[PDB]
Amino acid sequence: SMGFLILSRREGEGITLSLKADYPAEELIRQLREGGIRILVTDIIGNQARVGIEAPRGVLIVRDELK
Amino acid sequence: SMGFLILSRREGEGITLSLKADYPAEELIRQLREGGIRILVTDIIGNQARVGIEAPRGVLIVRDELK
């Protein structure tokens, strides 16, 4: 199954996607070749955009201001 | 160097990221572990959000309405 993260982002705010160190390379590459990552603009509430990300469990999703 | 794509997205519009079939698995996994993918909300022009994506060259970036 998939991890799902939707966050409000203002101008100049972002997200970094990386690979989790504890998951194996053969499997992550197969997660990403086969199904990929989906980015969705879910809502635009004025000066904010709610961005959804659906990604296999091996993908680390971190808001830029955290790391 | 990096591929860069910025597109206007309205509500319910998205992007799919996948891995290019012609690039080797060892290298792509190392592209993504080391540097990752950056998603940036660059501008919110009313009912549209301009979403930037910076990704290593091995990553295929496709607007949902194309494939």
Residue numbers in the entry:
A (entry chain A), B (entry chain A): 0 to 66
What did the original publication write about this model?
In bacteria, the highly conserved RsmA/CsrA family of RNA-binding proteins functions as global posttranscriptional regulators acting on mRNA translation and stability. Through phenotypic complementation of an rsmA mutant in Pseudomonas aeruginosa, we discovered a family member, termed RsmN. Elucidation of the RsmN crystal structure and that of the complex with a hairpin from the sRNA, RsmZ, reveals a uniquely inserted α helix, which redirects the polypeptide chain to form a distinctly different protein fold to the domain-swapped dimeric structure of RsmA homologs. The overall β sheet structure required for RNA recognition is, however, preserved with compensatory sequence and structure differences, allowing the RsmN dimer to target binding motifs in both structured hairpin loops and flexible disordered RNAs.
We have solved the crystal structure of RsmN at 2.0 Å resolution and report a distinctly different polypeptide fold to the domain-swapped dimeric structure described for RsmA homologs (Gutiérrez et al., 2005; Heeb et al., 2006; Schubert et al., 2007). The asymmetric unit contains a single RsmN molecule, with the electron density allowing model building of the first 66 residues from RsmN out of a total of 71. The RsmN structure is distinct and completely novel compared with those of all other RsmA/CsrA orthologs and reveals that the 16-residue insert between β strands 2 and 3 has the effect of redirecting the polypeptide chain to give a unique dimer structure. The RsmN dimer consists of a very similar ten-stranded interface held together by a sandwich of two five-stranded β sheets assembled in the same order: β5-β2-β3-β4-β1. The structure lacks the α helix at the C terminus, but instead, the 16-residue insert adopts a well-defined α helix between β strands 2 and 3, with the sequences represented as β1-β2-α-β3-β4-β5 and β1-β2-β3-β4-β5-α, respectively, for RsmN and RsmA. In RsmN, the noticeable difference is that the insertion of the α helix between β2-β3 sterically prevents these consecutive β strands from lying adjacent and antiparallel to each other within the same sheet. Instead, the α helix forces the polypeptide chain to cross over to form part of the other β sheet, such that the RsmN β sheets are composed as follows: β5A-β2A-β3B-β4B-β1B and β5B-β2B-β3A-β4A-β1A. Thus, the overall folding topology of the two polypeptide chains and their dimerization interface is altered by the presence of the α helical insert, making the dimer interface no longer domain swapped but the product of two docked folded monomers. Surface area analysis shows that RsmA buries at ∼4,453 Å2 in its interwined dimer structure; however, this is significantly smaller for the RsmN dimer (2,841 Å2).
